[PDB]
């Protein structure tokens, strides 16, 4: 009978169609919307590119492989198929690594990486990923039968020769899947917790500013980098003494772009830990929303834990949601008189709720990473765990389970473009305007 084989093959063909029309919709949408011409979208573009080539070639040739239960198109066809397949998938997981380190460096490195990232740099990183994936797999497959001497793969099958042993296969699974997964997992949980601090920075870049030399605040106080007050005394000799105390060497005045970035984070974390430690700042910080929190930090980042602890009547109104009543309550202080230009933008935040005074695009959690990673894990885990199982025995895993797990790794490339439309609304309207 085996008509179910033809039926299932048609389903996989349908699945392959959904994959290729889903990925080409992403490619087209990116090149016609103009509003999606950002860096992170270009990473999703290449991810869609890798899913496209693996959804138009790999899924089709594997369908015929399980259909006729053999490989009857020579050895070169099998070698080139597995090469392109593995490279594309390895470029896919490296791309996921790129995205993971992308918006993580956008957090930890506001100046080194975040303030220096173009579409050209993205193409280099992606291009580098494909080159690495190429060198790792393509010569390893092709030039292996020309290395040992004779081909192990018999006419009628199609697999990898240097993955004969289950030990070397499991080792590759660790270094190419388990290791990237744990990293992306660690990074993601260090993004979801540290996404609120990204916008905390842009406020301090407007108020305090950025400079490598040593200047003076809106009152004549020595400060280097991003709002880091070295000292309060009008003496330059002792000002640099505190500067070199934070760096580690004789800067003789000026610093670099990475040093200023480092000294910035040392004062922000000290402020936040200065809020939680303080008995009059901790309940206030926990009574405000995540958006109103950076505004409070801006006060602590400047005045200090003590300076903000001197506003008793003010902190009481913040907890009691007396925003407009606290807006005028903060307009009667030395801070509002000495450096008033920035105070107008801080107080406005406490009475409205949004940062329309500072403008700045809002950034909340990782809306894209959660979908694509969970999809990537759930789909590929039944295969890699099966490799772990296959390692400690032989006939413990049937060929059917290998084919299914191989297909589960294929639907990963199918769900990935669907994850794009199941998140951002800009991708939604662009997938809707198309096709008409
Ligand atoms: C979807 N794939 C195309 C197929 C199944 C998956 O296989 C895996 O997840 C593996 O750990 C292994 C494949 C083979 C031995 S260990 C990876 C390989 C490369 C990057 S991760 C991922 C890729 C890989 O080509 C196979």
Residue 376 beta carbon below 6 angstroms from any ligand 1 atom: no
Q: Is 207 a catalytic residue?
A: no
Neighbouring residues of 416: CB distance < 8 A, sequence distance ≥ 6: 47, 48, 51, 372, 375, 376
CA of 88, closest atom in ligand 1: 3
d(Cα 64, Cα 57) in Å, to the nearest integer?
11
Residue 381 beta carbon below 6 angstroms from any ligand 1 atom: no
Query: What are the φ and ψ backbone dihedral angles of 332, each rounded to 5 degrees?
Result: -125, 55
- Angle, alpha carbons 172-176-179 (nearest 5°): 110
> What is the sign, positive or negative, of the torsion defined by CA atoms of 125, 60, 28, 377?
negative
C-alpha dihedral (107, 111, 114, 117), degrees to nearest 10: -160
Question: Which DSSP state fits 157?
Answer: B
Point out which residues pair with 18 in neighbouring strands.
none
Q: Is 208 a catalytic residue?
A: yes
Measured in whole angstroms, the distance separating CA 180 from the mean position of its chain's CA atoms is: 13
Please report the DSSP string for 67-125 in residue order.
HSSS--SHHHHHHHHHHHHHHHHHHHHHHHHHHHHHHHHHHH-TTTTTTS--HHHHHHH
Resolution in Å, one decimal, please: 3.6
Other residues' Cβ atoms within 10 Å of the Cβ of residue 398: 9
Other residues' Cβ atoms within 10 Å of the Cβ of residue 405: 20
Other residues' Cβ atoms within 10 Å of the Cβ of residue 119: 13
Q: Are 217 and 338 in contact (CB under 8 A)?
A: no
Known binding-site residues for substrate equal 229, 301, 314, 329
User: How close is the Cα of 387 to the center of ligand 1, in Å?
Assistant: 10
Of the chain, the end-to-end C-alpha distance in Å amounts to: 43
User: Which residue has 């193409």 as its token pair?
Assistant: 123
Residue 86 beta carbon below 6 angstroms from any ligand 1 atom: yes
Task: Tell me the C-alpha to C-alpha distance, in Å, between residue 254 and each of 172, 189, 234, 349.
Answer: 47, 36, 18, 34
Which of 202, 217, 244, 325 is catalytic? The answer is: 217
Residue 259 beta carbon below 6 angstroms from any ligand 1 atom: no
Q: Are 428 and 421 in contact (CB under 8 A)?
A: yes
d(Cα 241, Cα 237) in Å, to the nearest integer?
7
C-alpha dihedral (307, 308, 310, 315), degrees to nearest 10: 180
Which of 51, 102, 207, 208 is catalytic? The answer is: 208
Other residues' Cβ atoms within 10 Å of the Cβ of residue 84: 18
For residue 107, how many C-alpha atoms fall within 13 Å in the half-sphere facing its CB?
21
Q: For the range 389-392, what are the long-range contacts, defined as Cβ-Cβ under 8 Å and sequence gap of 24 or more?
A: 390/166, 390/169, 390/170, 391/166, 391/167, 391/169, 391/170, 392/166
Q: Are 228 and 210 in contact (CB under 8 A)?
A: no
Point out which residues pair with 225 in neighbouring strands.
211
Task: Tell me the C-alpha to C-alpha distance, in Å, between residue 236 and each of 212, 230, 240, 315.
Answer: 16, 10, 6, 36
Q: What is the largest CA-CA distance in the chain?
A: 94
- Residue 129 burial by Cβ neighbours in a 10 Å radius (0-12, 13-18, 19+): buried
Other residues' Cβ atoms within 10 Å of the Cβ of residue 54: 26
User: Which residue has 């990232």 as its token pair?
Assistant: 117
Segments in 144-302 forming alpha helices (H): 145-148, 166-173, 179-189, 196-207, 236-247, 257-277, 282-285, 290-302
The whole domain housing 286 covers 196-352
User: Of the residues 60, 169, 176, which should be mutated to test ligand 1's pocket, given the most ligand atoms within 8 Å of the CB?
Assistant: 176
> Comparing C-alpha atoms, which of 45, 51, 50 is closest to residue 119?
45
Please report the DSSP string for 288-331 in residue order.
S-HHHHHHHHHHHHHT-HHHHTT-HHHHHHHHTT-HHHHHTTSS
Q: Are 349 and 355 in contact (CB under 8 A)?
A: yes
353 Rama class: left (phi>0) / alpha (psi -120 to 50) / beta: left
CATH number at residue 310: 1.10.530.40
């Amino acid at each position: 009978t085996i008509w179910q084989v033809v039926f299932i093959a048609f389903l996989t063909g349908f699945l392959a169609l959904v994959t290729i029309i889903g990925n080409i919709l992403v490619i087209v949408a990116f090149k016609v919307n103009k509003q999606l011409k950002t860096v992170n979208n270009y990473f999703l573009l290449s991810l869609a590119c890798a899913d496209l080539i693996i959804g138009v070639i790999s899924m089709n040739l594997f369908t015929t492989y399980i259909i006729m239960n053999r490989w009857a198109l020579g050895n070169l066809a099998c070698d080139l198929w597995l090469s392109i397949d593995y490279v594309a998938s390895n470029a896919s997981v490296m791309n996921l690594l790129v995205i993971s380190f992308d918006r993580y460096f956008s957090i930890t490195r506001p100046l080194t990486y975040r303030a220096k990232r173009t579409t050209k740099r993205a193409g280099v990183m992606i291009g580098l990923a494909w080159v690495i994936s190429f060198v790792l797999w393509a010569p390893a497959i092709l030039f292996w039968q020309y290395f040992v001497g004779k081909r192990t793969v018999p006419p009628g099958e199609c697999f990898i020769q240097f993955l004969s042993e289950p030990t070397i296969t499991f080792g590759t699974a660790i270094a190419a899947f388990y290791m990237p997964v744990t990293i992306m997992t660690i990074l993601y949980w260090r993004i979801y917790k540290e996404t609120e601090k990204m916008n905390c920075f842009e406020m301090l870049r407007i108020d305090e500013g950025l400079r490598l030399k040593i200047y003076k605040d809106c009152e004549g106080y020595y400060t280097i980098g991003i709002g880091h007050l070295l000292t309060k005394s009008p003496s330059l000799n002792a000002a640099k003494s505190e500067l070199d105390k934070a760096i580690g060497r004789n800067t003789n005045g000026v610093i670099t772009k990475d040093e200023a970035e480092k000294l910035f984070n040392q004062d922000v974390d000290a402020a936040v830990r200065g809020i939680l430690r303080n008995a009059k700042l901790k309940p206030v910080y926990d009574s405000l929303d995540a958006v109103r929190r950076c505004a409070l930090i801006n006060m602590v980042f400047q005045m200090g834990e003590t300076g903000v602890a001197g506003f008793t009547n003010s902190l009481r109104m913040l907890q009691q949601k007396r925003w407009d009543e606290a807006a005028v309550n903060l307009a009667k202080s030395r801070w509002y008189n000495q450096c008033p230009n920035r105070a107008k933008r801080v107080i406005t935040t406490f009475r409205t709720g949004t940062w329309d005074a500072y403008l700045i695009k809002e950034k909340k959690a990782a809306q894209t990473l959660s979908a694509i990673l969970l999809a990537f894990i759930i789909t590929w885990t039944p295969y890699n765990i099966m490799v772990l199982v296959n390692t400690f025995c032989d006939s413990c895993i049937p060929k059917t389970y290998w084919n299914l797990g191989y297909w589960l790794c294929y639907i990963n490339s199918t769900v990935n473009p669907v994850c794009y439309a199941l998140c951002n609304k800009t991708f939604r309207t662009t997938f809707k305007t198309l096709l008409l």
